[PDB]
Design a protein around this motif. Sequence first.
Motif, PDB file in Angstrom:
ATOM      1  N   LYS A 267     -14.824  49.183  -7.706  1.00 50.52           N
ATOM      2  CA  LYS A 267     -15.503  50.063  -8.634  1.00 50.52           C
ATOM      3  C   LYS A 267     -14.593  51.067  -9.279  1.00 50.52           C
ATOM      4  O   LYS A 267     -13.544  51.431  -8.754  1.00 50.52           O
ATOM      5  CB  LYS A 267     -16.711  50.809  -8.003  1.00 50.52           C
ATOM      6  N   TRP A 268     -15.017  51.545 -10.465  1.00 50.20           N
ATOM      7  CA  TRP A 268     -14.382  52.637 -11.151  1.00 50.20           C
ATOM      8  C   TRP A 268     -15.515  53.390 -11.786  1.00 50.20           C
ATOM      9  O   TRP A 268     -15.675  54.587 -11.569  1.00 50.20           O
ATOM     10  CB  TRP A 268     -13.348  52.193 -12.224  1.00 50.20           C
ATOM     11  N   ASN A 269     -16.363  52.688 -12.573  1.00 50.55           N
ATOM     12  CA  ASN A 269     -17.459  53.283 -13.306  1.00 50.55           C
ATOM     13  C   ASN A 269     -18.556  53.741 -12.358  1.00 50.55           C
ATOM     14  O   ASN A 269     -19.047  52.959 -11.547  1.00 50.55           O
ATOM     15  CB  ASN A 269     -18.015  52.274 -14.349  1.00 50.55           C
TER      16      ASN A 269
ATOM     17  N   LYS B   2     -22.110  56.685 -11.753  1.00 53.59           N
ATOM     18  CA  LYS B   2     -23.346  57.163 -12.334  1.00 53.59           C
ATOM     19  C   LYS B   2     -23.235  58.666 -12.522  1.00 53.59           C
ATOM     20  O   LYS B   2     -22.318  59.291 -11.998  1.00 53.59           O
ATOM     21  CB  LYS B   2     -24.496  56.795 -11.354  1.00 53.59           C
TER      22      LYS B   2
END
Lengths: 71, 109, 205, 150, 116, 52
Positions: free
Chosen positions: C52-54, C56
């Motif tokens: 992951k990077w993106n 919420k």
Amino acid sequence: TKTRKHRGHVSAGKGRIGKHRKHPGGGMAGGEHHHRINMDKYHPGYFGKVGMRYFHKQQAHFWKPVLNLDK
Amino acid sequence: TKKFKRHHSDRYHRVAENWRKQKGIDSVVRRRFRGNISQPKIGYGSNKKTKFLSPSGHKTFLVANVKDLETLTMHTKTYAAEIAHNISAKNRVVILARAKALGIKVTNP
Amino acid sequence: GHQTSAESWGTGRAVARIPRVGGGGTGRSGQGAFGNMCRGGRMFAPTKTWRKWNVKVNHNEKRYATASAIAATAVASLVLARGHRVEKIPEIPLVVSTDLESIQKTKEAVAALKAVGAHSDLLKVLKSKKLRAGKGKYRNRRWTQRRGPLVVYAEDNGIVKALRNVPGVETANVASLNLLQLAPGAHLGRFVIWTEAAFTKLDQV
Amino acid sequence: YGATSTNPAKSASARGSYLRVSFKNTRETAQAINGWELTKAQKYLEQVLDHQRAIPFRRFNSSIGRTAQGKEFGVTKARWPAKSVKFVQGLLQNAAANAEAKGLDATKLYVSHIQVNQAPKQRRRTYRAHGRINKYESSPSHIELVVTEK
Amino acid sequence: SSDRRKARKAYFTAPSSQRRVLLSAPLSKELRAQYGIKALPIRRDDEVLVVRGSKKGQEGKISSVYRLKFAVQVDKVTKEKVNGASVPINLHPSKLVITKLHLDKDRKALIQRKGG
Amino acid sequence: GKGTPSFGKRHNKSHTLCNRCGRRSFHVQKKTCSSCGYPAAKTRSYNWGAKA
RNA sequence: ACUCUACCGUCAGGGUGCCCUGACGAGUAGGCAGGCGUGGAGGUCGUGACGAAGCCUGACCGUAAGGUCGGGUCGAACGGCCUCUAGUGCAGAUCUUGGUGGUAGUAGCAAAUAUUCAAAUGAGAACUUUGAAGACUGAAGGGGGAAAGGUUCCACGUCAACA
RNA sequence: GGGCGAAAGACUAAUCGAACCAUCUAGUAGCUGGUUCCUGCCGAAGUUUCCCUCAGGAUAGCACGAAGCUCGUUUUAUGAG
RNA sequence: CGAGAGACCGAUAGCGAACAAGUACAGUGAUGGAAAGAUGAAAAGAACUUUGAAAAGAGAGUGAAAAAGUACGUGAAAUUG
């Protein structure tokens, strides 16, 4: 992710030196008896069946509103 | 006075001589000994009173480029009162011609 | 890493149990991708596109954060501290009329900011920027335009191209007026130049 | 080399690098002519290259014969090198020739430097039994000979 | 894109159409003030001059123009040889500026076509 | 030792070279070929002939 | 230790800024707190060819962590401010990428079919080449075809790598 | 798991009691070994109910970490060798 | 096939390979497969003189500097005077 404590000890994720798959006891465990795993004299496991399953409580079962008299 | 090392440095070359903790089980300085060095504690070292020398106890102020020149004193910054080496020789001579021309010593001429 | 084959063999010949040499293998070790301690085998943590990077965030923090960052503009001390500057200390953030739209060229634009008093935020850049290390020295990270005073439009959509081209400026809208446009690089307080119609569009939250 | 070209007016030399040659015998031959002046040096090498005298070995050991001709210092052991010595004799020759080119006193000059260097390997291979290849590499002796003004 | 080597990729294996242009050097001030043009491509019998350099503001011509090499031999920048032959000697044409532009047949109509 | 000098006989010559590819298991007897085939049907590109 | 008095470590109370000041402080697991840390970055002005990173060397505060200044030198790169992010601290599995060390100039220098002497040529000759003379084999050191290989024969031409 | 035997699993590219090469494969190892900053606060335990259970682990004994509060010296008797 | 960019390398990284890397080589063999980058503005890449047999050693010229000399960046140690 405590890189300072973890890499400069190497106990994080292990414990004491020779702890391999004896410590988590394989991965999973079954129902009845087996050797050196995390089963033993446990209280979970038994019964098994998940859900309140019946032929009345499925499709076409109409829902109720959230509706008190004073609320 | 007894100087410190990291142990086994005198045996072979694969030792960083800066102090590391004696980690696991036995070591002569773990269970405390004052002979073949000691283990550095907060009992040793300089105290909560002092800090920062020169032959007149004078603290420095690095006046690198021509950002804040007019800040350097001639009291606590009489002896040590340096410039910055990474900042060009052009700037160095300009700062020194102001800094040492307060009425202070600076190491470099 | 699986671009070689190297097998176990052990004693009886000069190679270990570790897959170093086998069916080929010069400085290309591993049976597949194996041996991170071995050079030219695998890595410890081989980086992956799957991970992951993106992340919420709340939308109700977005309209609060832009309000908070522009509230930091309304106090003059936060603006003139961080990197942004101003000659005119009171009456911040700055509001001009809708004669900002009547600016064609950057030659007129610099002259307008000169007169009103938002010119020490403009001229501030002296030398440029060369490079810096890593992907700073490789791709488009060489010349960077200063996040100096922000210009804010009013009537929406088509903003002013005249005040893109001022040295060290930004252009934006009243609606489109995001996080990085007010608080670039963590700390708050960037100078904002509004128009008359933009500052009454800002009378919402 | 090792030593400097101390000044090109005083100096005169000749190199002889990257040779296939015995390593100990080059620097052991070098000892017995170094310090000694060139007229004594050239006599010693033309004696041991022919049949007359040995070179007493000092710095190196190994299985070598102790005999009556072990005297150079108070030493007992010696050996009598030959094809190693013909190389070193050529360096005394050219260094003396180009010392007259400067206009010194060539044959009577002091030998300042001669020893040998080594660092990279000149890789050669020869075989042995059972599908085998062992090392068969040469020792690159960097033999110079500097004379200085004396 | 924004890339050192991959930008040079296009310059290196440039087609013969583009290699006409990439034999470039600027024009002199009274060529600009005569016409308008920035640069125009560099050919053999042009009178040349050195801009930036120790060969500062000297008169020259070009001897040869080369296609793949890009570099041109410059007349009057002349050294000898070990054998002793007075040769024109190489320079890359960015270090140069041309003072001649010819008129000819319809280079006359090239520089004044539809835009000019 | 049973091996290498006995292999130095090789009176029966098994494999020669292929025309299209260079796989030299083109047997005079079997007429096999581990690579693209000689003779072939389609091009014999096999999936297990690679790791990466 | 006992014992004098001071000093170092976290925290309490009275009253901020913190100071007075109690009780204890040998130490491995383990947890928490605090401090130093790389690649990278929203930021980015500041420094630079009138001399940047770097190389190399000296000065070199004191809490264990390793960093500022200064000298010889570079010929283009990189930090005020302000804070977020990752393949993030080495002495080791009969490990891994290579050079170099070691026995060592030591052994080996290739199955016991004598060699002696003179010349041609030359920078150098036991060996090429030639002569005088002897050892030696002659069901092979004589002669000679096929598979297999494929121009290795040949004449011309070189002494470097390489024997 | 077939080829093969007057037998010895001799034999098959130095591998034959199941040839060799390549892929799925980085198979897997309940066992063993190796494993990277510092100081300070501060720091135990080798004991147990119990198991087709034994170089392990559910639970209990003992002190981790964090927040909020928690003795006895000894006097009258009572029970048991 | 072209363009642009990403918190994306700067010769142990990454495409097998930046460079005559499939080309001096090795295996019957789809195959394995190393060593391996480099002057300046201009090559002017050292005429000429002198010593030695070539190697090697000194004066002299060219050029911005030869304190840039072709094996052409910065340079440490074992090795090695």
